[PDB]
From a paper:
To understand the molecular basis underlying the superbinding characteristics of the Legionella SH2 domains, we determined the structures of L. longbeachae LeSH and the L. pneumophila RavO SH2 domain in complex with tyrosine-phosphorylated peptides by X-ray crystallography. Compared to the Src SH2 domain, LeSH is missing two β-strands (βA and βF) but contains a 45-residue insert between the strand βE and the helix αB. This extra sequence in LeSH contains a structural motif called the pancreatic polypeptide (PP)-fold, comprising an amphipathic α-helix (named herein as αEF) packed against a polyproline segment via favorable hydrophobic contacts. Indeed, the SH2 and PP folds together form a clamp-like structure that grasp the pTyr residue.
We obtained crystal structures of LeSH in complex with three different pTyr ligands, including the phosphotyrosine itself, a 13-mer peptide derived from the pTyr381 site of DnaJ-A1, and another 13-mer peptide corresponding to the pTyr387 site in IL2Rβ. Apart from the pTyr residue, which assumed the same conformation in all three complexes, we were not able to detect the electron density for residues preceding the pTyr in the DnaJ-A1 peptide or any residues flanking the pTyr in the IL2Rβ peptide despite the high resolution (1.6–1.7 Å) of the complex structures obtained. This suggests that, in contrary to their important role in binding to a mammalian SH2 domain, residues C-terminal to the pTyr may not make a significant contribution in binding to a Legionella SH2 domain. Of note, the positive charge on LeSH extends well beyond the pTyr-binding pocket due to the presence of a Lys-rich face in the αEF helix. The expansive positive electrostatic potential explains the general (i.e., position-independent) preference for acidic residues by LeSH beyond the pTyr. However, the R46K mutant of LeSH bound the DnaJ-A1 and IL2βR peptides that contain multiple Asp/Glu residues markedly better than to the remaining peptides that contain fewer acidic residues. This indicates that charge–charge interaction plays a pivotal role in the LeSH-peptide ligand interaction.
Numbering used by the authors: 11 to 167
């Protein structure tokens, strides 16, 4: 009857309110966090938390590698209509780099995500959370109706 610790596809309003309900804004950054299915890249996990320094919710994507869960490539900063030609020229190169790196990353991650759950992938998720200095006691756990239904997470309990 155990519920996975991974959220399913939840919306941005719900993410903010879950963090606020668990008092993320009166605790250090990463003291409170949640883990959810990525809404952009199936097979990836996204860690959402509150960044005290910027007063915003931030997100970090993880995917399976041969070594276990690792951080995915991160995208360059979004275009701003105030951008100069220099910013936009750099963005072109950085976006191509991101897309190439993310395409390779997802192709490997999806294959591993699809493969049989010998379950020892779960330990590597905890390791990467520790390396990122997420307070594991601050993990927000989903309710049954909000938990991920991905078969890979059935024993992520």
């Amino acid at each position: 009857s155990k519920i996975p610790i991974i959220f399913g596809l939840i919306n941005s309003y719900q993410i903010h309110n879950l963090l606020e309900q668990h008092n993320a804004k009166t605790k250090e950054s990463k003291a409170v966090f949640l883990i959810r299915d990525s809404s952009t890249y199936p097979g990836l996990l996204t860690i959402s938390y509150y960044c005290q320094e910027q007063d915003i919710v931030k997100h970090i994507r993880f995917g399976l590698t041969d070594k276990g869960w690792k951080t995915a490539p991160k995208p360059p900063h979004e275009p701003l209509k105030s951008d100069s030609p220099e910013i936009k020229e750099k963005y072109t190169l950085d976006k191509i780099k991101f897309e190439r790196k993310m395409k390779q990353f997802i192709n490997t991650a999806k294959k591993l995500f699809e493969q049989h759950i010998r379950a020892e992938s779960f330990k590597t998720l905890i390791m990467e959370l520790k390396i990122h200095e997420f307070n594991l006691e601050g993990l927000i756990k989903p309710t049954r109706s909000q938990a991920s239904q991905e078969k890979h997470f059935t024993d992520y309990v």
